[PDB]
Amino acid sequence: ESMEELEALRRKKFTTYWELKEAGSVDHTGMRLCDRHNYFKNFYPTLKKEAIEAINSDEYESSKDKAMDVMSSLKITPKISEVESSSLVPLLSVELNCAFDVVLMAKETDIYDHIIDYFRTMLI
Template sequence: MVGKSSVSALEEYCAKNKLPKPHYEYIDEDDGSFACQITVMDTEAEGRGRSKRDAKHQAAFAVIKRLRLTDMPDLVDDSDVGIPTTDVVVQLRDYCVQHQMPLPTFEIVQQAGTPDAPEFTALCAVASIRRYGVSEKKKDARQKAAYEMLRIIVDDVNKLDYQMQVATLQSAQEDLEVERYKKFKTYREMTESTTGEMPGVLLCDRHNYFKQFYSELKNAAYKILSSDAYESEQEKALDVLEALKIKPKITKMPTEKAEPLLFIELNCDFDVVFAGPPSKVYQDIVGYFKVML
């Protein structure tokens, strides 16, 4: 049983111990992925995946961990556990386009295993940054490689803020230095691999973009910015964005403190991101457009 998948190992475990077979139920999710509900010995668990097979393996692995079957971990091959449930390849390409980065490339660099249990290694490259993913299916190997790449290149300012708030001053400073080194290393890899064109947008270009914005939209935003009728900066900031026809993407990150952190991305030709507590981030947006417009 060494190297068995979660599903096979669990079924053999049940047969060996004269237990009822696991019961699986599938649910189609709205985003095109699948959810699988598994029941074993009155214990339930759930798995999700981009296919029913992936969801089934995730569910089997989850119930093994929940039941704490001590003799199972050495038997289970969990190489496919952790496959993203959404199309990370598309997300990575969209992120690179939005942030003016080189487009990612994918290549199957190694094929191993046996015909019954193949193993593929995919390489994902963005500029000179390289990350790998391994799975028994080529498409899942690419998904894993894309996920590892996203973890490196995505700007996680909100994550740093979260770490600084919940950690002690000393540990937060150490974490910040580590993250700074990682980001500097990533930045150097990106810039050294290009032909003199640095990724990102100059502040003066961003300022000129908003100065030359549609006059009708700017006039509507001016009225809101100069108004004293608003009770909160949040209402004013959101109305300014609506007047400019800019749709924000708002992500909330819970913290151990009472006030959560917000990560607000403004989707326009020159993307801009604000991060901070609600009491400050909306104030920053209002101040930003008072200057930029």
């Protein structure tokens, strides 16, 4: 390999560089942007079936608990930080840290239900 190495080696180097620079913004999902939204659909059924069972379960103690359990079900690690704002109620953003660059944000009273809605829409 001559051209293939020139591609793969710089892929590795630059991906590591961007990961260390930003901890995100690294696109290595391998899907076209016209169809990158199919990322959550193309997981193994093992995670998907139990995650959708959890998100469809109504007995959950609270919306936050449901969100955390669903997110842990897909093995996706959370990352929640406080965005500066003029609102008295804190404006919190959540980063999922998965290969698919995804970020959600709202009031902390709604961020969990927002995560519920997002993963309800995507996981099919």
